[PDB]
Scaffold this motif. Structure first.
Motif, short mmCIF file in Angstrom:
data_model
loop_
_atom_site.label_atom_id
_atom_site.label_comp_id
_atom_site.label_asym_id
_atom_site.label_seq_id
_atom_site.Cartn_x
_atom_site.Cartn_y
_atom_site.Cartn_z
N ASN A 1 9.06 -3.42 -1.27
CA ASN A 1 7.82 -3.49 -1.81
C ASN A 1 6.95 -2.40 -1.20
O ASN A 1 6.60 -2.25 0.00
N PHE A 2 6.65 -1.26 -2.04
CA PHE A 2 5.77 -0.12 -1.43
C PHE A 2 4.64 -0.17 -2.35
O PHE A 2 4.32 0.08 -3.41
N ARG A 3 3.39 -0.50 -1.63
CA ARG A 3 2.08 -0.81 -2.02
C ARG A 3 2.04 -1.68 -3.48
O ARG A 3 1.08 -1.29 -4.21
N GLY A 4 2.87 -2.61 -3.74
CA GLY A 4 3.03 -3.53 -4.82
C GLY A 4 4.37 -2.96 -5.72
O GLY A 4 4.67 -3.86 -6.43
N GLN A 5 4.69 -1.88 -5.63
CA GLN A 5 5.65 -1.26 -6.44
C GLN A 5 7.08 -2.13 -5.81
O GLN A 5 7.33 -1.67 -4.53
N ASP B 1 1.78 -0.61 4.24
CA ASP B 1 2.19 0.10 3.04
C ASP B 1 3.44 -0.19 2.27
O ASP B 1 3.62 -0.27 1.05
N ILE B 2 4.69 -0.55 3.13
CA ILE B 2 5.68 -1.03 2.90
C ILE B 2 6.24 -2.31 3.52
O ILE B 2 5.94 -2.41 4.83
N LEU C 1 3.19 -8.16 2.97
CA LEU C 1 2.40 -6.98 2.75
C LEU C 1 0.87 -7.35 3.01
O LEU C 1 0.21 -6.57 3.61
N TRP D 1 9.62 8.31 -2.37
CA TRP D 1 8.26 7.36 -2.63
C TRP D 1 7.07 8.52 -2.82
O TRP D 1 6.97 9.02 -1.73
N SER E 1 5.50 -9.65 -0.98
CA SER E 1 4.09 -9.60 -1.22
C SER E 1 3.17 -10.47 -0.11
O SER E 1 2.14 -9.89 0.34
N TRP F 1 2.47 6.25 7.12
CA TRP F 1 2.93 4.73 6.46
C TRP F 1 3.34 3.83 7.45
O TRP F 1 3.98 4.22 8.23
#
Ligand SMILES: [Cl-]
Ligand SMILES: [Cl-]
Ligand SMILES: [Cl-]
Ligand SMILES: [Cl-]
Ligand SMILES: [Cl-]
Ligand SMILES: [Cl-]
Ligand SMILES: [Cl-]
Ligand SMILES: [Cl-]
Ligand SMILES: [Cl-]
Ligand SMILES: [Cl-]
Ligand code: NA
Lengths: 161, 168
Positions: free
Chosen positions: B129-133, B101-102, B95, B167, B92, B26
């Motif tokens: 922010n992990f891939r959107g989450q 990825d983060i 990213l 994660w 966002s 990652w």
């Protein structure tokens, strides 16, 4: 003299002229930005810094040419020239500083020694450059590079206007 | 007081973060305002930076946030830059720019002054922010601005270290 004093001298000079600064860093990792943001009156002369540690980041964020990186490497005059142009354009600043080097302990694959750092100072599209070779551990190299960038900027202000 | 603790050390945290990122393949990216690039600087002081990190930004003003990270003008007008909504949008934006990825975004009032809306000096918002989450957290740190910055960088990293252990 020390980093705080140098940064204060840069700020006062830039604010007096109504000039704005931006920065693009590789090996110094955001420590040049950090010095400027630690200054009391940052927003009066600075708001944008980038850290582009790899070739992909330099291409993607700053439009450094792939051919430049492949032929000259990221630690080169050509790279810092292009980094400075890219950040000047992104930020709409008067002055851009770009810094790229080998902090250590390793040097370049091409034999460039550890501690080699390239600098560009770009005033409205007129760019001056310098290579330095700093002694010390990697954190000391970075600190010396940040201070060199600032001290040289302070010296260069005179011949600009 | 495991995650927000003077008993943590920034380079020790950065070592743990690097290993966990490298183990998963990652990549991390960062967007900062009040912390000034000190978060990026921690990550770049770590020895094998390029194996897990290559892009950070410092966007110290509202305009820099709009320009560099596509933070909405409307978001800044309603919520200010020191807000959950702003750190979400900062995370966002970085990213996407970095293809990472983060993303971590940090926005706060380091001091001595607070917000015009009365937000106390020392208030700092975080987004991971992990891939959107995306998760967020508001902290209020004590000390002068140098101290608040160092605490915020350490907290960002300590929380990231914890999150990496869970994660997928
Ligand atoms: Cl001073
Ligand atoms: Cl001046
Ligand atoms: Cl002037
Ligand atoms: Cl700082
Ligand atoms: Cl680098
Ligand atoms: Cl060429
Ligand atoms: Cl650009
Ligand atoms: Cl210009
Ligand atoms: Cl030279
Ligand atoms: Cl909108
Ligand atoms: Na972990």
């Amino acid at each position: 003299n020390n980093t705080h004093e140098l940064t204060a001298e840069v700020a006062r000079a830039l604010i007096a002229r109504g000039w704005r600064l931006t920065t693009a860093e590789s090996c110094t990792g955001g420590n040049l930005a950090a010095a400027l943001c630690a200054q009391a009156d940052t927003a009066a002369f600075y708001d944008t810094g980038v850290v582009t540690f790899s070739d992909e980041a330099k291409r993607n964020v700053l439009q450094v040419r792939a051919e430049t990186l492949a032929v000259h490497s990221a630690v080169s005059e050509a790279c810092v020239q292009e980094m400075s142009s890219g950040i000047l354009a992104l930020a709409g600043a008067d002055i851009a500083i770009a810094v790229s080097g080998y902090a250590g302990p390793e040097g370049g694959e091409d034999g460039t020694p550890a501690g080699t750092v390239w600098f560009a100072w770009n005033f409205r599209g007129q760019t001056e450059t310098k290579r330095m070779c700093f002694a010390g551990d990697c954190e000391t190299v970075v600190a010396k590079a940040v201070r060199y960038a600032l001290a040289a900027l302070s010296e260069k202000l005179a011949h600009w206007q």
